[PDB]
Design a protein around this motif. Structure first.
Motif, PDB file in Angstrom:
ATOM      1  N   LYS B 121       4.020 -16.488 -18.130  1.00 48.49           N
ATOM      2  CA  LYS B 121       3.329 -17.538 -17.408  1.00 48.49           C
ATOM      3  C   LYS B 121       2.554 -17.053 -16.195  1.00 48.49           C
ATOM      4  CE  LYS B 121       6.235 -21.519 -18.504  1.00 48.49           C
ATOM      5  NZ  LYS B 121       7.129 -22.518 -17.879  1.00 48.49           N
ATOM      6  N   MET B 122       2.704 -15.793 -15.798  1.00 51.69           N
ATOM      7  CA  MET B 122       2.125 -15.315 -14.553  1.00 51.69           C
ATOM      8  C   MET B 122       2.025 -13.803 -14.638  1.00 51.69           C
ATOM      9  SD  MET B 122       3.321 -13.586 -11.546  1.00 51.69           S
ATOM     10  CE  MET B 122       4.806 -14.127 -10.684  1.00 51.69           C
ATOM     11  N   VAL B 123       0.950 -13.256 -14.064  1.00 53.16           N
ATOM     12  CA  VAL B 123       0.762 -11.818 -13.914  1.00 53.16           C
ATOM     13  C   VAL B 123       0.647 -11.522 -12.427  1.00 53.16           C
ATOM     14  CG1 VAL B 123      -0.724  -9.837 -14.385  1.00 53.16           C
ATOM     15  CG2 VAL B 123      -0.385 -11.621 -16.171  1.00 53.16           C
ATOM     16  N   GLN B 124       1.313 -10.467 -11.967  1.00 55.16           N
ATOM     17  CA  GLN B 124       1.206 -10.050 -10.572  1.00 55.16           C
ATOM     18  C   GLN B 124       0.781  -8.590 -10.540  1.00 55.16           C
ATOM     19  OE1 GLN B 124       4.761  -9.702  -7.732  1.00 55.16           O
ATOM     20  NE2 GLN B 124       3.564 -11.309  -6.688  1.00 55.16           N
ATOM     21  N   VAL B 125      -0.197  -8.273  -9.691  1.00 55.24           N
ATOM     22  CA  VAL B 125      -0.723  -6.918  -9.540  1.00 55.24           C
ATOM     23  C   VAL B 125      -0.559  -6.554  -8.069  1.00 55.24           C
ATOM     24  CG1 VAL B 125      -2.714  -5.384  -9.855  1.00 55.24           C
ATOM     25  CG2 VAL B 125      -2.380  -7.322 -11.438  1.00 55.24           C
ATOM     26  N   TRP B 126       0.135  -5.458  -7.787  1.00 55.59           N
ATOM     27  CA  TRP B 126       0.469  -5.201  -6.386  1.00 55.59           C
ATOM     28  C   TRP B 126       0.756  -3.717  -6.180  1.00 55.59           C
ATOM     29  CZ3 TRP B 126       5.880  -4.952  -4.323  1.00 55.59           C
ATOM     30  CH2 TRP B 126       6.860  -4.910  -5.336  1.00 55.59           C
ATOM     31  N   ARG B 127       1.239  -3.394  -4.967  1.00 59.92           N
ATOM     32  CA  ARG B 127       1.446  -2.064  -4.391  1.00 59.92           C
ATOM     33  C   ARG B 127       0.135  -1.498  -3.841  1.00 59.92           C
ATOM     34  NH1 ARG B 127       7.052  -1.344  -4.677  1.00 59.92           N
ATOM     35  NH2 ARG B 127       7.993  -1.858  -6.717  1.00 59.92           N
ATOM     36  N   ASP B 128      -0.050  -0.182  -3.903  1.00 58.93           N
ATOM     37  CA  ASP B 128      -0.977   0.512  -3.001  1.00 58.93           C
ATOM     38  C   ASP B 128      -2.373   0.638  -3.607  1.00 58.93           C
ATOM     39  OD1 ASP B 128       1.273   1.178  -1.133  1.00 58.93           O
ATOM     40  OD2 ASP B 128       1.913   2.352  -2.878  1.00 58.93           O
ATOM     41  N   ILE B 129      -2.967  -0.519  -3.918  1.00 60.05           N
ATOM     42  CA  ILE B 129      -4.304  -0.546  -4.483  1.00 60.05           C
ATOM     43  C   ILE B 129      -5.138  -1.604  -3.781  1.00 60.05           C
ATOM     44  CG2 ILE B 129      -3.575   0.298  -6.734  1.00 60.05           C
ATOM     45  CD1 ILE B 129      -4.089  -2.827  -7.503  1.00 60.05           C
ATOM     46  N   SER B 130      -6.449  -1.433  -3.883  1.00 66.55           N
ATOM     47  CA  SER B 130      -7.387  -2.514  -3.681  1.00 66.55           C
ATOM     48  C   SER B 130      -7.851  -2.966  -5.059  1.00 66.55           C
ATOM     49  CB  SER B 130      -8.569  -2.072  -2.814  1.00 66.55           C
ATOM     50  OG  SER B 130      -9.368  -1.138  -3.508  1.00 66.55           O
ATOM     51  N   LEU B 131      -8.354  -4.191  -5.124  1.00 62.69           N
ATOM     52  CA  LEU B 131      -8.608  -4.845  -6.399  1.00 62.69           C
ATOM     53  C   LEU B 131      -9.957  -5.538  -6.322  1.00 62.69           C
ATOM     54  CD1 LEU B 131      -6.707  -4.794  -8.727  1.00 62.69           C
ATOM     55  CD2 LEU B 131      -6.010  -7.151  -8.190  1.00 62.69           C
TER      56      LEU B 131
END
Lengths: 140, 140
Positions: B121-131
């Motif tokens: 139901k959900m995607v999360q993109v995180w940690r040491d990046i810019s997007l």
């Protein structure tokens, strides 16, 4: 929150200096957010690291140094005074023989000097935190 | 850069769906920045994870699922197509039996479905990046 992350500040340290950091993890502990503090020998992020401090929140803490590009003698601690979902206050004091890390007023980690702290020119605070305070003392 | 990080977006997936991500690491590979993509079963960040994808840039990739709060059957890869200092394009395609991860146009990792992708139901993109880009297809 208030300060930019990765946070980079030029710095000088000697016996009696304290680095104070106030922040909050960006995720619950189940998601294992990280916190990292690195005392660098130059302003470049790829420079050597006199004191590397990396928290995997809720799990472990790793400390090391990086010398001529290579990681040296990682040590590990399971001490975990940080609290799930809470703002923390972190204090790193430069003692004659070691750094002492206080967490929320409690002595939690120590790391013997491998390089004189006078070699430090920059501190970087980064990974999965927000940051509302960063301070270095310059009294002595 | 452009998108907020941690990046959270409600999502639905089935065979034929693709999640496309464009971003850049926030630090040189010597500093070991991370990237993480998690396909969650609910909007809450502490919900179960059908597909957990974690890059330690320049080092390794770990994949797992988190079921009823517990990490299940971590697998590890040393494949490292990401390039130091460069923007990457990451594509995660939902095939009948597995996710396929493309990096910069090259098949790089696969992960067999442990839970039907319809549970996402959900995607999360995180940690040491810019997007700068995040897209899910909804054509089928």
């Amino acid at each position: 929150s208030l300060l930019p992350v990765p946070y980079t500040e030029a710095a000088s340290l000697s016996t009696g200096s304290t680095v104070t950091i106030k922040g909050r993890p960006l995720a619950c502990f189940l998601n294992e957010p990280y916190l990292q503090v690195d005392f660098h020998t130059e302003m470049k992020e790829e420079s050597d690291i006199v004191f590397h401090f990396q928290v995997c929140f809720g799990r472990r803490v790793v400390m090391a140094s990086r010398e001529y590009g290579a990681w040296k003698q990682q040590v590990e601690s399971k001490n975990m005074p940080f609290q799930d979902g809470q703002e923390f206050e972190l204090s790193i004091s430069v003692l004659p023989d070691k750094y002492q890390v206080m967490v929320n007023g409690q002595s939690s980690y120590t790391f013997d000097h491998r390089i004189k702290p006078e070699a430090v020119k920059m501190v970087q605070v980064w990974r999965d935190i927000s940051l509302t305070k960063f301070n270095v003392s310059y009294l002595k």
